[PDB]
UniProtKB/Swiss-Prot annotation:
Keywords: Chromosome, Cytoplasm, DNA-binding
Polar residues bias: start-end ranges: 103-114
Record feature DNA-binding region, as residue ranges: 19-88
Shown stretch of the complete protein: 1 to 114 of 148
Protein name: Single-stranded DNA binding protein Ssb
Main location: cytoplasm
One Gene Ontology term of the molecular function aspect: DNA binding
A GO-annotated cellular component: cytoplasm
GO terms, biological process: double-strand break repair via homologous recombination; response to ionizing radiation
Length: 124
């Protein structure tokens, strides 16, 4: 609930943040005992900085560099001492710009930054 993306907390059941896509890769299928899934590797940021963000399924293949993406109730995980975000059908993904703030361009995402209030107004 209103958590920084750059400094987010891994293994969080619910995370609400809005970030701009700066780096993204083509989704690849991963074979597993339970089945196979198409996952894509991308890094996004805007709230305070950039963090690892991997999407699962069609969502994984629906990402694009330069495209601003907003996520709600996002589930994150941490492996090898690294911070990453996981999303799928259960998670809600929609196109939106910085809430209350100008835009990601005005807020450096390369490194963690300080800001006052996540947004002027919003829901959930």
């Amino acid at each position: 609930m209103e958590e920084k993306v750059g400094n987010l907390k891994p293994n969080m059941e619910s995370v609400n943040v809005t970030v701009r896509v700066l780096e993204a890769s083509e989704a690849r299928q991963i074979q597993t005992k339970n089945g196979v899934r198409t996952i894509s590797e991308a890094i996004v940021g805007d709230e305070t900085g950039r963090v690892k963000l991997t999407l699962w399924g069609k969502h994984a293949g629906s990402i694009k560099e330069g495209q601003v993406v907003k996520i709600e109730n996002a589930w994150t995980t941490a492996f090898k001492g690294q911070v990453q975000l996981n999303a799928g059908s259960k998670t809600k993904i929609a196109e939106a710009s910085e809430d209350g703030f100008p835009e990601s361009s005005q807020i450096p995402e390369n490194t963690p930054t300080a800001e006052n209030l996540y947004f002027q107004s919003g829901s959930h």
